[PDB]
From Swiss-Prot:
Maturation and modification: Ubiquitinated at 'Lys-48' and 'Lys-63' by RNF146 when auto-poly-ADP-ribosylated; this leads to degradation. Deubiquitinated by USP25; leading to stabilization. ADP-ribosylated (-auto). Poly-ADP-ribosylated protein is recognized by RNF146, followed by ubiquitination.
Span of domain PARP catalytic: 8-209
Subcellular location: Cytoplasm; Golgi apparatus membrane; Nucleus; Chromosome, Telomere
Tissue-specific expression: Highly expressed in placenta, skeletal muscle, liver, brain, kidney, heart, thymus, spinal cord, lung, peripheral blood leukocytes, pancreas, lymph nodes, spleen, prostate, testis, ovary, small intestine, colon, mammary gland, breast and breast carcinoma, and in common-type meningioma. Highly expressed in fetal liver, heart and brain.
Descriptive protein name: Poly [ADP-ribose] polymerase tankyrase-2
Parent-protein start and end of this portion: 952 to 1161 of 1166
Coiled-coil ranges from the UniProt annotation: none
Role: Poly-ADP-ribosyltransferase involved in various processes such as Wnt signaling pathway, telomere length and vesicle trafficking. Acts as an activator of the Wnt signaling pathway by mediating poly-ADP-ribosylation of AXIN1 and AXIN2, 2 key components of the beta-catenin destruction complex: poly-ADP-ribosylated target proteins are recognized by RNF146, which mediates their ubiquitination and subsequent degradation. Also mediates poly-ADP-ribosylation of BLZF1 and CASC3, followed by recruitment of RNF146 and subsequent ubiquitination.
Organism in which the protein naturally occurs: Homo sapiens (Human)
């Protein structure tokens, strides 16, 4: 079902996706423990993920949510890092991609900061790092992130001091850091059909000069 189309680095689509990656790196409170130490990426490949059944499943949900929310899907593009990226692009998001222990209950988490999603590429809190070197700051091994279409609908705003259900009458949760003024929002959805893994980004973190 799924096919991957490579974007040309010469294509403005590839460049705006790269731009969204690079411009949303920030420093993290763990000093790089989970995702490694870096200020920018070496982007290796960007692919468009194409799956007609998964897309129809997404837009069918999007229209439902839209209809329930002052005609507004509230659709965003957000990063998602996960060791199960191969399964997500083939079979879609589901409960086995839910972060049981997350701050906003058991759902599927996305971030505005690419560097926040990079923390999850090798597992929760970076797991034990790359499979080859066991290094959470590995500069050699190739990482992948998804840059996804996410339907938020009516989003419950939850300020944070940094499968379950949406709070009644809402279709997601906005987790908004209230202490770190440079940290962008995270978002949690509770139905796999509310996200589509539109781009697959293959990259390395770069060692700071
Ligand atoms: O990109 C992400 N992937 N996985 C998780 Cl649990 C997560 C949790 C918070 C913020 C971002 C992410
Ligand atoms: Zn490695």
């Amino acid at each position: 079902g799924t096919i991957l189309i490579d974007l040309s680095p010469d294509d403005k689509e590839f460049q705006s996706v790269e731009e969204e990656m690079q411009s949303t790196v920030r420093e993290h409170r763990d000093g790089g423990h989970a995702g490694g130490i870096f200020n920018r990426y070496n982007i290796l490949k960007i692919q468009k993920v194409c799956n007609k059944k998964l897309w129809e499943r997404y837009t069918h949900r999007r229209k439902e949510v839209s209809e329930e929310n002052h005609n507004h899907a509230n659709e965003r593009m957000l990063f998602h890092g996960s060791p199960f990226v191969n399964a997500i692009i083939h079979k879609g998001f589901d409960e086995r991609h839910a972060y049981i222990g997350g701050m906003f209950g058991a759902g599927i988490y996305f971030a505005e900061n690419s560097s926040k999603s990079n923390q999850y590429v090798y597992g929760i809190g970076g797991g034990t790092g790359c499979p080859v070197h066991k290094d959470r700051s590995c500069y050699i091994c190739h990482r992948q992130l998804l840059f996804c279409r996410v339907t938020l609908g009516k989003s419950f705003l939850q300020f944070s001091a940094m499968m379950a259900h949406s709070p009644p009458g809402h279709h997601s949760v906005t987790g908004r850091p209230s202490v770190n003024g440079l940290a962008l929002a995270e978002y949690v959805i509770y139905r796999g059909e509310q996200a589509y893994p539109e781009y697959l980004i293959t990259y390395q973190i770069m060692r700071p000069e």
